[PDB]
Amino acid sequence: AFSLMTIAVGTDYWLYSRGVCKTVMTHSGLWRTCCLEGNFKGLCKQIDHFPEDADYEADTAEYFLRAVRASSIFPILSVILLFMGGLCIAASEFYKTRHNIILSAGIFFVSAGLSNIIGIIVYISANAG
Amino acid sequence: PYVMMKKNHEMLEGNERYEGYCVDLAAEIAKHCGFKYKLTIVGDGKYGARDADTKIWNGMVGELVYGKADIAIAPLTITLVREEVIDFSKPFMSLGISIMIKKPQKSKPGVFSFLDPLAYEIWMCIVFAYIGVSVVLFLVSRFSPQSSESTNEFGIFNSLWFSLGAFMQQGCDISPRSLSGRIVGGVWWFFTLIIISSYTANLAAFLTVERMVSPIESAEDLSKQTEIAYGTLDSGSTKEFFRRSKIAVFDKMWTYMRSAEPSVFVRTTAEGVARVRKSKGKYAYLLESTMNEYIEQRKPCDTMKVGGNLDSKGYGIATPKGSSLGTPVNLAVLKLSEQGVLDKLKNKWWYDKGECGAKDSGSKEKTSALSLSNVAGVFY
Amino acid sequence: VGGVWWFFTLIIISSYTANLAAFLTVERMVSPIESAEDLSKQTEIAYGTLDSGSTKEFFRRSKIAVFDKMWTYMRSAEPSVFVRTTAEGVARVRKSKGKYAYLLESTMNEYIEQRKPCDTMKVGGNLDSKGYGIATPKGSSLGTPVNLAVLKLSEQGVLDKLKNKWWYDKGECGAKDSGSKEKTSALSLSNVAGVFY
Amino acid sequence: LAVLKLSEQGVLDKLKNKWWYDKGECGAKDSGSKEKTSALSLSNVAGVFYILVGGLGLAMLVALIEFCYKSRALFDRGVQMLLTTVGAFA
Amino acid sequence: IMIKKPQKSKPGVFSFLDPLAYEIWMCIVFAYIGVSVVLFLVSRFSPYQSSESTNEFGIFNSLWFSLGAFMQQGCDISPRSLSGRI
Numbered sequence: 065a066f067s068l069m070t071i072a073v074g075t076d077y078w079l080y081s082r083g084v085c086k087t088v089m090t091h092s093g094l095w096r097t098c099c100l101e102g103n104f105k106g107l108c109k110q111i112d113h114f115p116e117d118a119d120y121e122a123d124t125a126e127y128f129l130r131a132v133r134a135s136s137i138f139p140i141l142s143v144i145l146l147f148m149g150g151l152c153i154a155a156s157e158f159y160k161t162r163h164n165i166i167l168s169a170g171i172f173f174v175s176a177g178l179s180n181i182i183g184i185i186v187y188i189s190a191n192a193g
Numbered sequence: 194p195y196v197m198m199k200k201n202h203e204m205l206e207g208n209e210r211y212e213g214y215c216v217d218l219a220a221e222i223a224k225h226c227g228f229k230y231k232l233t234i235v236g237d238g239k240y241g242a243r244d245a246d247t248k249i250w251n252g253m254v255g256e257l258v259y260g261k262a263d264i265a266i267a268p269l270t271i272t273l274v275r276e277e278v279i280d281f282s283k284p285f286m287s288l289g290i291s292i293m294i295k296k297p298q299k300s301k302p303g304v305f306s307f308l309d310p311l312a313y314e315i316w317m318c319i320v321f322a323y324i325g326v327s328v329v330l331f332l333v334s335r336f337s338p339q340s341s342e343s344t345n346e347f348g349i350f351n352s353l354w355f356s357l358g359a360f361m362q363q364g365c366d367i368s369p370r371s372l373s374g375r376i377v378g379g380v381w382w383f384f385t386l387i388i389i390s391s392y393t394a395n396l397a398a399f400l401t402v403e404r405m406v407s408p409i410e411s412a413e414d415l416s417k418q419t420e421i422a423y424g425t426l427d428s429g430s431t432k433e434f435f436r437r438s439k440i441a442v443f444d445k446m447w448t449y450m451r452s453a454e455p456s457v458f459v460r461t462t463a464e465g466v467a468r469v470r471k472s473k474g475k476y477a478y479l480l481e482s483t484m485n486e487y488i489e490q491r492k493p494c495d496t497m498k499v500g501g502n503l504d505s506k507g508y509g510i511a512t513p514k515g516s517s518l519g520t521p522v523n524l525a526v527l528k529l530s531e532q533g534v535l536d537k538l539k540n541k542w543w544y545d546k547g548e549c550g551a552k553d554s555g556s557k558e559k560t561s562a563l564s565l566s567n568v569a570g571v572f573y
Numbered sequence: 574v575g576g577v578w579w580f581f582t583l584i585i586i587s588s589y590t591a592n593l594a595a596f597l598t599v600e601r602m603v604s605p606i607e608s609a610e611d612l613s614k615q616t617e618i619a620y621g622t623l624d625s626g627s628t629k630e631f632f633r634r635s636k637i638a639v640f641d642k643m644w645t646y647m648r649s650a651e652p653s654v655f656v657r658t659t660a661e662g663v664a665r666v667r668k669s670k671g672k673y674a675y676l677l678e679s680t681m682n683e684y685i686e687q688r689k690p691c692d693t694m695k696v697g698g699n700l701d702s703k704g705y706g707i708a709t710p711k712g713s714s715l716g717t718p719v720n721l722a723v724l725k726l727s728e729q730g731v732l733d734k735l736k737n738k739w740w741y742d743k744g745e746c747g748a749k750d751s752g753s754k755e756k757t758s759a760l761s762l763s764n765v766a767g768v769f770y
Numbered sequence: 771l772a773v774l775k776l777s778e779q780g781v782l783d784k785l786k787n788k789w790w791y792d793k794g795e796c797g798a799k800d801s802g803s804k805e806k807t808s809a810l811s812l813s814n815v816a817g818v819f820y821i822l823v824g825g826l827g828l829a830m831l832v833a834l835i836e837f838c839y840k841s842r843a844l845f846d847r848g849v850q851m852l853l854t855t856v857g858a859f860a
Numbered sequence: 861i862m863i864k865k866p867q868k869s870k871p872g873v874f875s876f877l878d879p880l881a882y883e884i885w886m887c888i889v890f891a892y893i894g895v896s897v898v899l900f901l902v903s904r905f906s907p908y909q910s911s912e913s914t915n916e917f918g919i920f921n922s923l924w925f926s927l928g929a930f931m932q933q934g935c936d937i938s939p940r941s942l943s944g945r946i
């Protein structure tokens with residue numbers, strides 16, 4: 065489980081849409097929107113939540129969604145909690161008989177899915193427009 | 194189909210070289226009038242209308258006025274400019290100005306069409322949330338509390354079956370009875386009351402109208418739009434209709450006909466048909482209804498007529514002024530019209546080539562039942 | 574087995590309650606005879622024609638077999654199917670209550686249907702076409718200025734505007750222009766009566 | 771005299787009807803009133819998925835604290851009689 | 861007056877609670893607490909082995925019956941008295 069998050073954060077074929085690679089299909093990702101099927105190809109640029117011609121100023125609901133999307137805390141949280149559950153389940157070999165440590169592990173796995181599942185929801189929410 | 198090229202032209206000879214509506218109608222009138230006849234084709238391939246400063250007609254009637262041709266049996270519009278200097282017999286076919294546009298796509302409902310009123314991100318996020326709930330309702334109901342963890346009936350497999358029971362709203366076998374068990378059982382109940390109701394509210398929306406509404410069928414929006422350019426045949430009586438408009442929307446039609454860059458007037462009708470097919474909504478063509486009938490009755494079947502006719506003009510058998518044959522010609526047409534001959538000829542060419550042959554007028558009523566083809570998916 | 578039959582139920586039942594109040598108030602139109610072929614398969618209703626008429630002289634000169642049957646129906650029919658005026662043929666249809674048909678010209682049958690009481694209906698396509706023309710004696714001097722004048726009205730749409738004016742400004746029945754507009758009502762017990770049965 | 775003579779015939783109004791309507795029309799001016807239906811988007815129903823996950827984190831919290839309370843280890847009949855006394859007063 | 865014409869606003873994250881006004885959702889919650897106390901009151905009311913705990917409806921279960929009855933979901937328990945079924 066710890067592999068498939070840290071792969072998915074550090075890879076960038078998240079979305080197949082059409083958009084500008086320089087500033088027209090996109091090798092679009094969670095951090096770096098990249099581009100395929102163009103005259104220029106293989107250049108990956110930094111993504112940008114845009115305040116220039118924004119049309120969401122003084123929104124209560126969007127200003128929460130801008131922060132959570134482009135600073136993707138929830139898939140980052142879904143890595144660390146999945147990593148923290150990995151250390152408690154690694155610590156059952158040595159320093160065992162504590163008999164509490166895998167519940168402390170297993171809640172961190174279940175939490176890491178609840179972090180992961182809402183990281184999908186904020187991702188589908190923001191890119192729609 | 195007024196004159197069509199016969200397949201065996203180089204085999205056959207004379208008037209048998211051609212086959213068409215007028216070719217049949219010429220044979221019918223020559224029986225009743227009793228004259229030998231020899232068909233020809235105009236060299237212009239055009240309709241005779243007037244030159245600037247010259248009045249010399251370039252087309253069939255210019256071959257008819259000037260002693261070259263004797264009888265003109267053709268889809269020739271009886272307009273005032275022609276009849277003041279040629280004769281017409283009484284008309285043989287009724288028609289008017291009408292529009293050809295491409296019906297774009299058929300797009301009947303697929304077999305998994307019932308899943309449509311929710312998007313496929315939602316169904317994916319439902320299944321993720323269904324697993325996400327049922328693992329949490331397991332984890333709560335199985336802790337260190339003799340074997341008093343067993344007092345909760347919720348293993349994980351009863352947990353998947355509870356939340357499936359709560360989602361499909363088909364009741365449930367048991368119920369959580371802890372405090373934190375009833376929280377997850379309560380929230381998932383509030384979840385499924387929104388989602389299943391958002392399904393049934395939106396599926397009522399798909400079950401009245403799921404089709405296409407025609408963009409320019411009112412014919413005043415057709416004159417309106419600057420994206421949808423509209424044209425007609427050059428030196429055609431449709432163009433000659435709008436040059437003397439007295440209706441205000443028809444006054445605006447001629448202005449964009451005049452002020453289109455480049456010329457939307459196409460050199461033939463068949464090339465004008467092929468322009469709208471290439472356009473895909475970008476261009477419209479204006480043509481006669483009986484000329485727009487045969488376009489629908491041929492493959493690729495993607496041409497259809499919107500609105501009624503814009504007017505009511507007619508076609509005529511044409512003769513020169515003072516042509517002595519033209520009066521038994523004129524008595525022939527009233528004989529052919531009453532004997533059902535002309536309608537039978539209007540039948541034959543315009544149905545038997547109904548390769549498309551659909552006659553799909555449409556079940557217009559929005560109070561129409563579900564069909565088994567619409568809900569075939571859940572049985573699969 | 575149960576889990577799929579649940580999801581089967583969720584789709585079928587929610588599709589059943591989609592437009593259910595509409596189907597209990599369909600308000601169908603029956604239209605028992607249309608499309609002159611089906612005049613000849615349901616020939617028991619009594620046809621009607623005008624005395625001294627082109628509709629007479631058309632069916633007197635019958636050639637098509639569907640057209641020949643309906644006149645050879647009317648000539649041996651009892652009593653005399655002919656009426657002396659249009660107001661006699663219209664009124665004979667209205668009384669007989671779906672049992673007497675009258676075959677008549679397309680524009681009067683357009684006109685009668687528009688005018689209230691509006692209890693009649695124009696069904697079927699036109700079985701031919703024919704024209705009204707302004708007429709002069711053979712060899713009249715006025716024939717040539719009139720013959721040029723007919724198109725000269727028609728190319729301007731004057732005749733069409735005069736046809737737009739007169740056949741629409743008269744008595745309009747309610748289901749002709751604004752009868753398409755709809756509304757909702759409570760369910761009546763005559764709509765749901767089979768469920769109580 | 772000519773201004774009214776146009777205006778009483780509605781000529782000026784017809785000329786005002788002509789020019790301000792025949793120009794460039796935006797789509798939501800005449801036929802923008804017409805409506806249509808579409809599938810629900812997840813941005814439309816997103817709060818219900820928040821509240822579900824918002825409830826699941828809460829339920830795991832309360833289930834944890836009843837374990838920390840029970841692994842560590844109470845009303846009195848008198849103090850609830852005082853508590854129903856103060857609550858009735860307020 | 862001319863302004864830059866605004867964008868057509870998306871619905872909020874609480875768009876589910878829009879078909880019923882704010883004044884009703886407060887009175888649905890108030891009717892919920894009102895029912896579950898009365899359903900707690902009617903049963904578990906000195907019946908005459910020990911009759912004081914014959915019914916299964918505590919205060920906490922009777923909240924769960926009324927929450928279950930509102931969400932169109934069946935529950936395990938049922939009132940089972942003439943005054944409690946009302």
Ligand SMILES: NS(=O)(=O)c1cc2c(cc1Cl)N[C@H]([C@H]1C[C@H]3C=C[C@@H]1C3)NS2(=O)=O
Binds near residue numbers: 283507534705
């Ligand atoms: N079937 S059709 O509409 O092509 C059609 C149309 C017409 C036909 C005959 C047929 Cl078959 N003949 C009539 C004729 C009868 C008299 C009235 C008009 C001319 C002389 N002209 S029409 O009304 O234009």
Ligand SMILES: N[C@@H](CCC(=O)O)C(=O)O
Binds near residue numbers: 268270426480
């Ligand atoms: N039949 C028509 C063709 C051209 C047009 O439709 O304007 C004519 O003779 O004028």
Ligand SMILES: N[C@@H](CCC(=O)O)C(=O)O
Binds near residue numbers: 623629677
């Ligand atoms: N208008 C018709 C009247 C007779 C009929 O309707 O048949 C005619 O001139 O002959």
